[PDB]
C-alpha cells in the first residue's frame, strides 16, 4: 500500500581531522609570511609546493627541529593535493611589533575516503532495486538535496548515479547554523562533570548496567592507552615499520599513523585531564585505522610473545576498543542535549526547517497520485531530527538508548502508504571492527533498515508533531 518515501541520509566514510602545529624562528620560516604581520592562510596548491620547497631548504641548512620539519614536510607532500588541506601562519610579535617567531599550523583531512563511493553506490543500487519492485513510476519523481560540505555532496553524487543539475543544495535546511552552537556550548560544559569524580552513572544516560562508574572506565582507557604507546615506541625503535602493511590508501604512511595516535596518546595519559570532546576523536580514529590500516595496527601494536604459544595477545587492545565505544555512546549523543528540554531546544534550532519540509512533502505525496525525496546531511542533523521524533510522544517500538550508533550512511525514512511508518538504519556500522572481514577497498556493507514505529495514522502523526512547534 506504498505511497511515498522521505529519506534523510548521512554522509559516507570520511578521514579523521588531523593537524600539526609547531613554531619556528628561523628566517626561512619567517619569510613564508611574505611580510604580513597577521595570520596567513595558504590553500593554493602551488603555494603549498613553495612552502614545501622552503622545508627542503631548511633541511639542507639546519633551520629548525630537523625531526619535526620532516614530519610536517612528509605529511605535506602526501597531503598537498587534498582539498581542505591548508597552512596557517600565526606570527608572534614582540614588544617592538617585530615578528620574532611564527607558528606553522598544517591542517588536513575531513575528506571522504576512497571507500565512500562504494558505500553510496550500493545504497543507490539497492534503492533502485527496491523502487523498481514497489513502483517503477517512483524513479520518475526523485528529488535530491545536499548540504554545502564537499563530503556530503560527494555521498549524494554517487548515490544519485547508483540510483539511476538534479541535486539541489539547500543551505537553510541541511547546512550548519550557529543557532545551536550557542546552546551546545552550555551543554558541553555540563558533560565534563558527568565523567569525573564519582557520579553514579547519573540517570539512564545511555550506559550499561554491568559497567563500573564512568570515571573508572576513563581511568582504564588511559591505562590501555599508556600501555599501547610503549608497545608502539618499542616496535618503531626495533622493527622495520615500513613492512608492517602492504597497502596504504589515502596516501598515508607509518609516519602519519604515528602522528594520529601520538596526539591521542598525549591526550589520554592522565585520567584527571581527559576532555570529553576528545572521546569522539579517539573513537573516530579507531574506526578509521580498523577500516583502512588494520595490518599496520596489528603489527605496530603486536607485543611479541609471552612464553606460551598462540597465547592471545590482543587482549588489551580489544578491551580498549570496547571501552571507547561505551564513552562514545554516553558522551557524544549527549552533546545534542542531556535533558529532554536540551535535546528538544538543540533539536529545533538545528533541524526545524527540514522537519517542516518533510511533513509538507508527505502531505503533497498524499494528494499526488508515489515519489521520493532524499536529503543528504551532516551527522548533526540525524541525531537532532531523531530527538524531535521521540520527544513528540509518538508511540515507538524501540527506546532511544537501544538504537545503534548513527554511523556513516545512517538513514531516517518516512514511508507513506493512509499510514506513516518510520524506519532507521545505522549505516555502514559493525559491532566487531577488529574481526570484520574486509576487502582491499576497506569497505563495510550497509545494515538493513529497521522499523522505529508501526503503521500510524497520518492525521495523528501531524498533531503530535505540530504540537511540539511552540
Ligand atoms: Zn598583512
Ligand atoms: Zn582504505
Author numbering: 538 to 701, 709 to 913, 915 to 962, 973 to 1025
Verbatim from the authors:
Inositol pyrophosphates (PP-InsPs) are eukaryotic nutrient messengers. The balance between kinase and phosphatase activities regulates 1,5-InsP8 levels. ScVip1PD is a phytase-like inositol 1-pyrophosphate histidine phosphatase with two conserved catalytic motifs.
Crystallization of ScVip1PD Δ848-918 yielded a second crystal form diffracting at 3.4 Å resolution. The two apo structures of ScVip1PD revealed a conserved histidine acid phosphatase core with two insertion domains. In ScVip1PD Δ848-918 crystals, two molecules in the asymmetric unit also adopt the “open” conformation. The Zn2+ ion is coordinated along a pseudo two-fold axis involving residues His573 and Glu575 from the GAF domain. Given that ScVip1PD behaves as a monomer in solution and that the histidine and glutamate residues are not conserved among other PPIP5Ks, the second Zn2+ coordination site is likely a crystallization artifact. Similarly, deletion of the large disordered loop in the α-helical insertion domain (ScVip1PD Δ848-918) moderately activates the engineered enzyme in vitro.
